[PDB]
Amino acid sequence: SCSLLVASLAGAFGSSFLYGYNLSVVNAPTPYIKAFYNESWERRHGRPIDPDTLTLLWSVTVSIFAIGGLVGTLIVKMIGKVLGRKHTLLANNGFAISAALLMACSLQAGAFEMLIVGRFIMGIDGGVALSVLPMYLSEISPKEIRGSLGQVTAIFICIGVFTGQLLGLPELLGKESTWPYLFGVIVVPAVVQLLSLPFLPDSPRYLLLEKHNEARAVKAFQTFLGKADVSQEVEEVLAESRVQRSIRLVSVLELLRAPYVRWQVVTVIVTMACYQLCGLNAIWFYTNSIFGKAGIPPAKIPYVTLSTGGIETLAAVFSGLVIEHLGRRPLLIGGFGLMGLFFGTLTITLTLQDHAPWVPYLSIVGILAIIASFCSGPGGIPFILTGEFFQQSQRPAAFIIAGTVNWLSNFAVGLLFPFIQKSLDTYCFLVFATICITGAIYLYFVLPETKNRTYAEISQAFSKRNKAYP
């Protein structure tokens, strides 16, 4: 199906690419903006910026993109009752172009507030992007390609971190006189998506249930599937809709107060909190800050930075092989278990850092070992667990609690990491060592095996500890 390849590639290039891109495009123009932050504050109410609030303003610039994602996730529930899937992504790109023009024109306008507002509005684009695209590919693709398409959304996030770090080199787009043109190229994925996507048909499942366009649904289904015999595919959608409309939707507040699923909710929350508080996002936001403090002499940091994002892209195509052939529960304790170990081997490298010239180069290897552990393990399991503990009437009320901690914790790593770098000095990764160790320890005792098990056995394992037998 040639029409499916263009829809999947251009759909991820405009929205899922830009989430990965804006995770890593912030690290490389870091010494330029904090020089521009001081200049704009000096060409204003005039005192030099004290060193505490320069990093506080910079941490706000880094971490307010997470608040935009938190704001953006709540918006999709409002759009979902008024707009489609293709039309949402097209309308979502209004945030992408508007925020890209705000950050790229921050230096030309001479005001640094547009950079903070620009980061927040791009976060709204990213939060909507990660809440529509996993729903978008599932409806337009057959049931036997759904599992592999979870990789594809994750794959283009990896390339965005690669591209954002690749564009941050001094050779291409990362100079002092050039740095506003780093956020200005966010327009190009938005423009490319804005042309190809509206030509493609809408999501067939949305227009079937809500728009009542069975005649249009057949034409829409045949484009993505490439087959004439579609009658079995349509009748399955109405077969799912009669069950979906019959069940009573569980509200968000009822799920927290329900004693039957008490231990499943905290299992989702702690895993999702440790998914961000493990500190992988702290690597992307401040990679040159870590390598600058890890004994590495300068003028090669932008290329060592390029290695951190490079391994994740190659490890993401190995991730599905790891998911398929080993299990689900050994990966989660194994994932944060290797993180806490290699955070310790990270900590021992910057602690001495001066006993031999090859000691700082081990701190490189200690970081790709952390990144390879993420992609193989916790990279896509918290998203796939949350839809497995909970039933169909509880899944949209479960992803929202998984959604909000996924951005509040992400905002916590973004703001607090520069401050714990200043106090702990080398030992700043020992805090992140404790989170993954506590994450692996907690999931050792609470999490049961979730591969090839029905919902009844998953609930049965929690019923031993929940004590609220149905």
Swiss-Prot record:
Changing residue 105 to V: No effect on fructose transport. Increased urate binding affinity and decreased urate transport capacity. Disulfide bonds: none annotated. The modification Phosphoserine is found at residue 463. The chain crosses the membrane at residues 1-20, 56-76, 89-109, 120-140, 149-169, 180-200, 265-285, 303-323, 330-350, 364-384, 400-420, 427-447. GO terms for cellular component: apical plasma membrane; basolateral plasma membrane; membrane; plasma membrane. The keyword Glycoprotein applies. Changing residue 328 to W: In RHUC2; markedly reduced urate transport activity; decreased Vmax; no effect on protein expression; no effect on glucose transport. Changing residue 360 to R: In RHUC2; uncertain significance; according to PubMed:18701466 the variant results in decreased urate uptake, however according to PubMed:22132964 and PubMed:29967582 urate transport activity is not affected; no effect on Vmax for urate uptake; no effect on affinity for urate; no effect on protein expression; no effect on localization to plasma membrane; no effect on glucose transport. Changing residue 280 to V: Increased fructose binding affinity and decreased fructose transport capacity. GO terms for molecular function: carbohydrate:proton symporter activity; D-glucose transmembrane transporter activity; fructose transmembrane transporter activity; transmembrane transporter activity; urate transmembrane transporter activity. GO terms for biological process: D-glucose import; D-glucose transmembrane transport; dehydroascorbic acid transport; fructose transmembrane transport; hexose transmembrane transport; urate metabolic process; urate transport. Glycans are attached at residue 38. The keyword Nucleotidyltransferase does not apply. It catalyses: urate(out) = urate(in). Changing residue 164 to R: In RHUC2; decreased protein expression; decreased urate uptake; no effect on glucose transport. Pfam families: Sugar_tr. Changing residue 73 to M: In RHUC2; markedly reduced urate transport activity; decreased protein expression; decreased urate uptake; no effect on glucose transport. It is linked to Hypouricemia renal 2: A disorder characterized by impaired uric acid reabsorption at the apical membrane of proximal renal tubule cells, and high urinary urate excretion. Patients often appear asymptomatic, but may be subject to exercise-induced acute renal failure, chronic renal dysfunction and nephrolithiasis. NCBIfam families: SP. High-capacity urate transporter, which may play a role in the urate reabsorption by proximal tubules. May have a residual high-affinity, low-capacity glucose and fructose transporter activity. Transports urate at rates 45- to 60-fold faster than glucose. Does not transport galactose. May mediate small uptake of adenine but not of other nucleobases. PANTHER family: SOLUTE CARRIER FAMILY 2, SOLUTE CARRIER FAMILY 2, FACILITATED GLUCOSE TRANSPORTER MEMBER 9. Belongs to the major facilitator superfamily. Sugar transporter (TC 2.A.1.1) family. Glucose transporter subfamily. This is Solute carrier family 2, facilitated glucose transporter member 9.
